[PDB]
Every structure is written in structure tokens, then in C-alpha cells.
Amino acid sequence: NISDNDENILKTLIADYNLRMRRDALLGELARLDELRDISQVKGVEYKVTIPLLPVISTLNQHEFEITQANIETDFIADNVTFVTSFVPADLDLEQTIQRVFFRTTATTPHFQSFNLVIEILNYDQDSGDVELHVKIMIVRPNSDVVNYDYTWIGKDYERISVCYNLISHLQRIDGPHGRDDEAEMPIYRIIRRDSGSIPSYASGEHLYVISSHLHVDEIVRRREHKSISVDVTQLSLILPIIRTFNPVDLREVRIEDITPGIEFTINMEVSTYLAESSGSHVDMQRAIMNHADKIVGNYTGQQWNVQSNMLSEVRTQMLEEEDEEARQRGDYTTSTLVQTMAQVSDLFSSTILYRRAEARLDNTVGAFELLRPVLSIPSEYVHNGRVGPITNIPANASIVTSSSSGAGQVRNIFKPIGDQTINESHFANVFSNDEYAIYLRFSYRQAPVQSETVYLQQNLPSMRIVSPSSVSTTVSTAVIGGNTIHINCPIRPHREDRLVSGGVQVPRQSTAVEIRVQEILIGYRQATTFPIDTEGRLSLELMYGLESRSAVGNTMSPVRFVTVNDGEFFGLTCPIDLTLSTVVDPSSYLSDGVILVATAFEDLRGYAWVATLGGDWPRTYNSSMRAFNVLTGGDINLSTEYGSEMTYTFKVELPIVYMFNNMTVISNNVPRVPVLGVTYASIYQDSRTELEARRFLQTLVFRIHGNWSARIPYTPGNLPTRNTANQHQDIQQVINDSISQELGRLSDELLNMKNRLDHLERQFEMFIQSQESEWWEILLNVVMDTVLGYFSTFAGNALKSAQQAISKAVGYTRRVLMTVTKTMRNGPIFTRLLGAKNLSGQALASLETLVESVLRSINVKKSRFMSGAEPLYKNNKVAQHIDNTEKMNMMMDFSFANRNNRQNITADTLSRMHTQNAHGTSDTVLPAMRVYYRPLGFLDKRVGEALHKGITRPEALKKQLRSDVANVGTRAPSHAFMTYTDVLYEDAGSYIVSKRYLGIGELNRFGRTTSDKNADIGGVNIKYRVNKITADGKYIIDRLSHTESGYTAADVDRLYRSLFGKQGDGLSTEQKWMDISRGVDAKIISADMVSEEFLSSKYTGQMIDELINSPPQFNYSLIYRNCQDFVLDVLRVAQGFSPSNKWDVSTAARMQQRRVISLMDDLMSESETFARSAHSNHSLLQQIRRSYVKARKRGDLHTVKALQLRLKGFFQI
């Protein structure tokens, strides 16, 4: 059978196996089986090629969710928002008392009020992690109905459980049109979310389910053969959005109250970029909800496949290196120091100060300033002997007993404030603001209580008092001689069996000493840097508060420098006025009405009571006070008694002033006074008061100002801007934007003519080309000419790459192109302030200039021939917005703000709140976002850890920690990356076509040598919309186009659906497949990460991307890239105007360049019908020319090539 040498070989193979077993046992308990780990990895790859790319979902943790809620100030509603509670039992902190997730909403919703989840660990063997869990979910409905769900699970330490709660809000109906917006030539529709006379617009539902898994690692190790993981989804509740109701779920109103450390919690939302109407069909709604659920479940399953692979044997991962914060900080700090040195140099220039004439007339204006507290005074030591009073509401029914039989006791109340009531303050009252100047009134305020008599009005219907019990005391035993032993049991609000916790006190009033003394009124100019001169004018001031009033006139004004508390220092002129208003004679004249309450109601005081017994064996005095009351309110609540035949029950409350004034109401609004001099109500006086009228009467100071002034206002010196940049910039982006703003003034205003601008840009491009050492431009021109005439070259991609490298190396040319674009567009400075902390990228602008110039030099025509028409030019020329950066910027700004940017003298601060995008925050980009998204879905990227236990450690804890480490390290990679590119087209007065391009790629294989049906692949689509409609709040409403209008056939739709959802849509028509594809792309990327760049999109870069989307290359991504994010980063780089990757094959970039040039040439030939013909530019004649050219090029015939190039050039002459 075998020889002796073969037997020796067998023995050494056995010995090697034994050495492997020895090593494995040295390392610990975890398995090390390489073949089973490899089979697991291959099967996981096979599953992962099926995880859907769509829909687009954004994942946030708690911190990023809170920052996002703070960022968005308009309506914030998501079609699907899933709250996933995910945990691994080996990651839970077992020293915690409870494992809980609790979150709620502060508003009314059709289905949701609060969500509570508790995890109970019934058994947990930590040596071999065998856990038995019980999960209890509690949902409280808005009508206070409680719904309970249970889930039990027996499994392993390292397996994951996810509880997913989806809140669904579908916009099903828009009502209108209710008019026509005139700035944006669109009809106006409304979107009803709140209770009104209109039909509601939204329908709401919910979806609750649990995901569990079993990774049969123990069985696989015992039997030594692989077994696929098994994932179970349990459906707990599904409510479809069938009927339309008011109050959809707004995410700004959702609170996450408590999550036990160790539990993972994410928010997974899909929010539309613009508002759109959903389908009312039931099957369509259900597919919409289940696509969201299926993507979440697919990502869960991929993660669990990773966990099984990692448990079966050793898997090593290098974690991607994070960018160096500290090196970037040193570079930025050097740049900032250079700017400071430039400012020091510019400080050497001095010039004569030049002024300008300033005149202004202040019409009759009204302003109201509210003091910190209402003007009141609480007397000390206020005693009230009634049964009902400030503190007590004890009915006569209530049983109150004394030592004598049937002897009712008398109750009294004592109230005492704690602390000072005098206040000294100086304020800068706001008067009027303007982009030129701002007016402030400066005064000082005095208050103190004056010796007088208290005034106390008691309500016929008193509010729920703090001490309002059913009974106060009862008799337990009666003695013939000694007296009756009494037991007192007096609870305080709230009672143990109660709803809507409440309680309070009524406060006695007094009279105080008011002293308002106005010193002067000040005005400052924004751009003044030194004292103005020739200051003259007159101002009149009228004070009025309560019942008194004053008036004075100021004549002399002087140049002044003053500092406000929010805006900095101002330079201007002051108008001293010396008047005093003093209502010490009548400070207390609200006497008709005038009940004052203070609310003291707390969850922590429920069930508290005074419990004591008095009598023979018991002491004859009682003196007790609640200390929880002191903890919550820095005061006291007390009850004192003396045992005797006649007993008095003293209920004393003793509050501090600060707590009192932070908690009070001014009911008895029945007799509200009027502003003392018949002034119109100032929106802080009975303007939708809702019981706020007496506090405004007692707190608000209102004044009336009229006058005029004149002065000479200095101009800013010319050497100031660099000092300003050094003195107040925060980032390097601010330095760049400041340089742009200052350079806008250096450029000539002759550039505001189209011919001059085109000549300037041609001269810039000639400078750029003349400075090239290598001759890449001539070969590029040859490539472009061949492409136009039909001969497609393999190194068009090389030509494109050389052009992009030349552009990125010549940053001066890019800077000049950007500067002329910013100068020649409408409202350039407004735009530079709109940018904020971001910079516009000029690489794409110069890229477009180079492409257009290349084609035009090929056909031997100037650009001015294609730029003819009336203004605005992009509305009268169908190619101008595609070949010109200035017209593109104009069109994009008109689109982004619905022509609100064209209002006269509108500031960038006002315009910034008029964007037309849905759920748009000010931290978002003005132009459409264009970036790569790469984050996990349904779980965090790291685990929440623990601190090391302080005690002595034991082996099963070490084993549990190792299991947690292996379950968590390297398994939380995202399953895909993607990128979006969107371009906007103007077609008619109120019609736009928005073209969104999606490109995504799945996670790369561990084993990439397999065939392409089992490798990671890319999936992309181009989707179009039409903008015709707007809301009354200024936001666009979208209609989505069909697949035919996007260029797709039925077979194309089948291929796209397979790429984007990972399956053949079975039982779906092409209409349903396109509905799913189109609806899955309109979601918006929500993140707390901030971008610092703006990018302008172009139609021909979009064609370059469509070249990848429509005819993808035969590429093995798994073998070439380390990461699926790197591919989409390469594509995004190409989209941003940079060169193609050297990882790609040659023909990829070749085809991209051919597509962009062919698209531009078609556009130019279509436009040339105005100055050429269509009979001699027919498609049939051009096809013959192209076929002849290809044949002539393939056989080296220069005569025919030249003749055909002349024929093509002559197409554009006559």
C-alpha cells in the first residue's frame, strides 16, 4: 500500500497536527479552523452580493441625532424613520441595575407617544456563553392605551438582537393650487399638518419587528462541517398609512430619554430632498415599507456572517488610518501667522480720513423693553387665619379634631419670602436696526420695597393648593381625665392616587419703589471706524410704564464710541437725555384684580404626609418640615401644633424669590390696563396673549421715539481689510473668502459686459496654454477632432488625464476663472457671504472652460457665436447654461432660492433661510451636495466599552471578554458605499428638470478570484424629476418622470432593478420596478459631519458618469481595491474636476471623454441652426461623413481626412 518512507511522512504529518493542537490550546478556548472559516467567508460573500443598495438610508447615533435636530429649524418629517435598539449580550454591562431604552415625543402623533424596552437576563453561563433573554416592549398610544409585546430568546453570547420600530409618514395629498407665486412662476399648494379647516395631507402608520440569529458555531466545530447562519424576523405590529390624519411625526419633537450604557441605539431615516406625493395604492405602500425593512435586515445578516467567520478562526484586519489632525493644525497655523504678518505690513500705509454725508429721519416708532421680573413686592410674615388661604384648601367636611371631643381646630397660614427684593440694573434697550445703523436706548433701573400694608385677594375658586387633603387628624383613643389621643395624617399634593400632578400657593402683594432713569440714546454705524463729525439733529423720547409717563427732548449730539453686549463696539453719535420716571407714589395700582400664584408640584413629593400621634404617652408638640421640598425648592413647608383643649394648625410655606419668580402666573387678567399713552399693542402686549396680559403690564416698559440727525461718516481706510482678516477670521476658508471679496473691487466693471467677459476668459486660457512645457494640448486637440468625426481613440482617457493634471497644477488660472465668475454673476458679494464657512471649488469651472475651448478650437468657431440672445441669457439660449459658468451660476441661484435672491438689497442672512430644499439646515450646502456616504446601518461602528473591574478577576470573565473582542473587532464594516450627482435644467418659466445620478458599490469579497456573478459589483441609475409646484412656505414639490423619459427600456429596468435591489423583482411590472427605483433614490443624506467645499455640476460631467452607469466596465473590484469606498471616491474625484484613477483600464476613461465630447458637439450643432442650416447639417449627411472618416483614418489617407475636417468646419460657416 505505502512504503516505509511514506509511513515516516504520515507520522510527521500527525506530529505537525499535534503541534497545531498544542498551539491552539496555548492560545485559549476559541476555535482555530482555517478551512471552516474560509468556507464561512465564501458563503458570506455569496449572501452579500444580494444585499440591496436601495433605498438610501441615513444612520445617526444619539449625539448626531441631537445635533441634527438642532441644525434643522423647518418641518422635519421622514417617510420612514426606524429606531433600532441593538445589543450583544457579551457587551452588556451586568453591573447596571436595569437594561432599558426609553424615548418619547412631546407632541401629538396618530400612533405614538412613548416607547419603552427592558432586557432581562434569565440565565447567563459566562464560561460558555449561553444566554437566555426576555425582552419586553411597551408602547403607549396617544389616548393613553398601553400595548405590551414579549420576546424570548435562547442563544449564544456573541449573537446580535435588534428591535426595530418604524414610524411611517406618507404625504398623500396636496391641496390647491391656491394662487400663483410670481417670483417663482409656479402655482402654490399647501401642505396641511395641523388641525385647521382643511383636509389633512399626511397618512401615518407604524412597523415593529425583532431580528434574531443563530450562528451554529458549536455545531460546526463539533461536526467539522459548515452550516449557514439562520436569521429570524418576528413581526409584532404593522399599521399601514391608510387614512389621512393631522399631526404627522416631526423628528424635532422626539426625545431620547434613557439608554443603558452598553446598548446600541441608532436612528435610520430616509427624508426626501423635495416634497413629493406618495402612491395611495396598498401594495405600493407595503413595498415602500418593506424595502426599508429588507435593507435593514440585509445589513444585519451581513454583519452576522462576519461574526460567524471571525468565531470560526483567526481573521486579521488593519484599521484604516485616521487623518492627522495635528499636522493639519500646524499647516493652518502657519498660514494664519502669514496672514498676521501681511496685516502688520499693511498697517504701514496711512492716508487722510475721508468722510461722506449722512442724513436720517427717525419716524414715529414704538419699542417695548421687558424687565427681568414683574415689578412686585412680597411682604414678610403674612398670617391668614381662615380655613382656606394661600397655602391650604381644607373643606369643612374634612375631619379635624382636638383633645376635647368634637372640637374643631383652627388652621392658619404663614408665608415668608427668603432674600433680597431690591435690584440694580443697567440695560441697553433695542430701538431700531438697519443694514446701515442701529439705535439703542441706554438707561438704568432701580427697585426696592417700601414700608406699606399688604394686599391679598383670595379666589372664590382657588387653584389646587399644596395642602388640600381629605382629612387632617382623627382621634384614636379617648381618656376620661387626660384627653383624647389624636393621630394626624395630612398629605400634600400630589396624592398617592392621582393624575396630573399639581399644587401651588397664592402670594400677598405690597408696594415697591421704582426709579427708571434714562441717561442717553445711542446710534452706531456698521462700517464706521472712527468718530464722525458735524453731528446735529433732534430726538424726542417718551417713557411710560404702569400709569405714569415722562417725556423729554434732546438737541445736542456728540460723536460717541459704545460697546453693546452682543455685536461689539460701534462708532456713532449720542443724544443725551436726562429724564426720570418714578412710580413710587402709585406702584401698587393693579389692586382691582391681582391674585398671584406660585406653582410647586413635583413627582418626588407624591405620597408625602405629616404623620404623628399626640396624647398621653406621646409628646404634646409637633414641628416637622418636608426636606424633599427643600431639595426641590430652596425653601420650607412646615406644620406646627400644640396639644390642648383648643388647637391651631399652622401651615407655613417659605420660598425664595428666584424660585417664586421663575414659577408664577398672573391670573386675574380680568381688568388689564392699557399702554399709558394709547399706543398700538407691540406684539409683547395682548398679541395672542394666552393669559399673558397682567405680567406684561407689570413687567414691560414701552417707549416712543421720533427725530432726525445728520453727520459726516468716515470711510474705512484702504489698508483695513487685511487687518480685518487677521483680526476676526476663524478658518483658512475665511481667509480665502475674504481675499475673494476684496479682489472683487480690483477687477474692472467692464467685465459686466458679455463680450468683454468672453475676451477676458479667452485671454486667461491663452495664458494658461502658452505656459505648458509639454505638448499635451496638441494631442488633445487631435483626439477631440477625431472623436467629433467618429474615430474613437483608446487614449482619449490619457488626454483627459493630462488636461486635468495641468488644470490642477495651475492654481492661478483656476483662481482667476473663479474670480471672474464671482465678479460677473448677479450678486457676487451676497453669494460669497452665503457660502459661510465653505469655499466654492474652481477646478470644475476651469475643467468646463478647457473642454468647451477644446471643442471650439476643433471646429474653428468663437464662443460668442453661441451666446446670442436677450437677458437673462439662460432663459433665451438653450446652450448657454451648459457652456457658460456665469449663466450656470445665475440659473442655479435662481433655482435654489426660487428667485428670492433677486429681491432688492436682500442680505445673505435673510436669503439663507429661503432655500427650496426639504428639511434644509443652514449648515448645508447652497448648491446640491456631492459626496460619498460610507457608514454601517442599524448598529454603531464601535462598541460601547467598560472600565476594568476593580476586584479580583476570574477565568470565565476573561473568556467572556475575549468572546466580546472577537465578536466586535473587524465585523462592523459597512456593506456598501455610494455617491450622488445631481444637475438641474431650466426649460420654461416655472419648469425645471432635476436629474439625479446614483452610483453605489457593494462590499468587496474576501476571496476575489471567483467569477463576476459572485463578486462585488457596482449599481447605478439616472433619475429625473420635474419642478412645477411650490408651497406657501417656499419649498418645491416634485413630480417624478417615467423610465422612458429617463432613457430606459423595459429590459434596462429589469437590469437596473437587479443591480439596485439584489433580486429579480418577481410579480412586479416595469412600472412598479421603476417606482421602487425612483423612490429609493430621492432620500437625502442626513449627517452631523460638515463639508467645507461647494461644487458646481455640469451636464457633460453627468454624461461622463452615465457612461459608467449605462455601460459598466468588466472590472474585478475585489482584486484591485482594498475598499469599496475607494472606488466611489475615485468616481467623485472625477466628478469634481480631477483626473481619472490609474487603477482603471484605459478604455474606461477613454469612453468617458468620448461621451462628454460627443454630447457637447451634439449641443453645439443643435444650437448652430440659428446661424447655420439643418438641410446641410442633417443626421444622415453627418453619418456618411463619419463613416468615410473612420475608413480613411484606418488606412492612413491624409487627403480624405483633411477634406472631411474642412467639410465639418464649413458646416458652421454658412
Side-chain angles (χ1 to χ4, degrees), residues 78 108 200 207 248 286 334 387 477 513 519 540 575 588 643 696 726-727 756 770 794 879 895 927 964 1037 1118 1139 1181:
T108 300
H207 187 210
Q286 190 140 9
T334 297
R387 291 286 292 271
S477 172
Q519 298 144 353
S540 310
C575 174
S588 195
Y643 188 88
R696 288 163 166 187
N727 267 359
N756 299 339
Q770 286 317 302
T794 308
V879 66
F895 172 78
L927 300 174
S964 168
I1037 305 170
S1118 304
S1139 54
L1181 167 64

Side-chain angles (χ1 to χ4, degrees), residues 553-591:
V553 180
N555 290 314
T556 79
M557 294 183 286
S558 315
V560 65
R561 162 199 185 283
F562 65 97
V563 161
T564 186
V565 298
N566 288 328
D567 307 330
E569 66 183 1
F570 283 98
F571 269 103
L573 72 164
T574 191
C575 174
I577 288 188
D578 301 327
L579 64 85
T580 310
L581 192 153
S582 296
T583 62
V584 190
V585 293
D586 210 18
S588 195
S589 177
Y590 202 60
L591 310 170

